[PDB]
């Protein structure tokens, strides 16, 4: 089994209820333990961030997260602005950086 | 899924369109909820829409004019239009959009629409 | 930004055309178009979304796609009750929102 913990992540100046309709709960919602990152107004220039979470507890944590790849290029800069993305990912043992990859998929 | 607005009806240039519409059979914040005009002509405009949370969704080349609030609890959600000139002439129509990504993708079940002449 | 022709004609039954001719920013980009079914005096109903999927109370006769820059709705079995305006719908992102068409119109015989 798993016990869930809150990160306990606070977003300021973006949108955080990025949603859809292929997951329904009374409407449109999105995964329950995640939340999309948006810009704050569609093509908005989305804002740098960094953002930390320390292990406390004595057994390991199960850390997961999504990189967004977008159905158009025009979709990715609706959603989080123009411009180049990037998300780097930072451990004691662990530092990888992704960059999406815009396309259609089936 | 019923869906009805109200509000003015005739008003002269540079008022304040306020309109107002009210829902049956649904609940906020499943969706987007947006107001779309039509002139008596021809064309389509979408002007803006909001979710539960007050998190709007506005039309660059109306905003600055245009304001949209939403009443959670009452099941309606209203329009501010502000210095209205006489192009602003047109049937508007509330609908519900759904949500998939940022703002609407889609509209289903529309409302009924009201005509707002406005000349002097 | 969603250019259709004003006017079809059309006999009982035959297959009509619906053209939705858009730019490079709004269905030259993975943006979905849809049509929407605007009856004398009423409000628009929708009809095909995700550019060709129907929703329930649509028959079969209404059948759209999406290819390139445009899209085309097909009215195959001509009814009398067809009389309507048909509009299309996508995302422009030069706008930043939601555009629609100018509109077209249906008429059949006799």
């Known amino acids: 089994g798993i016990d869930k913990e809150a990160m306990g992540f606070t977003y300021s100046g973006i949108r955080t209820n990025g949603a859809t309709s292929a997951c329904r709960r009374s409407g449109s919602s999105f995964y329950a333990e995640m939340k999309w990152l948006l810009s704050n107004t569609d093509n908005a220039a989305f804002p740098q961030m960094t953002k930390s979470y320390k292990n406390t507890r004595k057994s390991p944590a199960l850390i997961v997260w999504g990189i967004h790849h977008s159905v158009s290029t025009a979709e990715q800069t609706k959603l989080y602005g123009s411009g180049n993305k990037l998300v780097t990912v930072g451990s004691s043992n662990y530092q990888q950086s992704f960059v999406p990859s815009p396309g259609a998929r089936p | 899924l019923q869906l009805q607005e109200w509000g003015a009806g005739l008003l002269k240039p540079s008022e304040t369109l306020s309109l107002t519409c009210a829902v049956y059979g649904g609940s906020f914040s499943g969706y987007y909820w947006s107001w779309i005009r039509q002139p008596p002509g021809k064309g389509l405009e979408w002007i803006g829409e909001i979710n539960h949370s007050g998190g709007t969704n506005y039309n660059p080349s109306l905003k600055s004019r245009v304001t949209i609030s939403v009443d959670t609890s009452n099941n309606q959600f209203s329009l501010k239009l502000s210095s209205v000139t006489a192009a602003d002439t047109a049937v508007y129509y509330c609908?519900?959009?759904?949500?998939?990504?940022?703002?609407?993708?889609?509209?289903?079940?529309w409302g009924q629409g009201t005509l707002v002449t406005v000349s002097s | 930004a969603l250019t259709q022709p004003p006017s079809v004609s059309g006999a009982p039954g035959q297959r009509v055309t619906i053209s939705c001719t858009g730019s490079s920013s709004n269905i030259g980009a993975g943006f979905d178009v849809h049509w929407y079914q605007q009856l004398p005096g009423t409000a628009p109903k929708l009809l095909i979304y995700?550019?060709?999927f129907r929703p329930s109370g649509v028959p079969d006769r209404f059948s759209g796609s999406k290819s390139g820059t445009s899209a085309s709705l097909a009215i195959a079995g001509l009814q009398a009750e067809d009389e309507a305006d048909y509009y299309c719908?996508?995302?422009?992102?030069?706008?930043?929102?939601?555009?629609f068409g100018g509109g077209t119109k249906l008429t059949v015989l006799g």
């Open positions: 719908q996508s995302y422009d992102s030069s706008l930043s929102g939601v555009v």
């Open positions: 609908a519900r959009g759904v949500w998939e990504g940022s703002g609407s993708d889609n509209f289903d079940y």
């Open positions: 995700g550019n060709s």
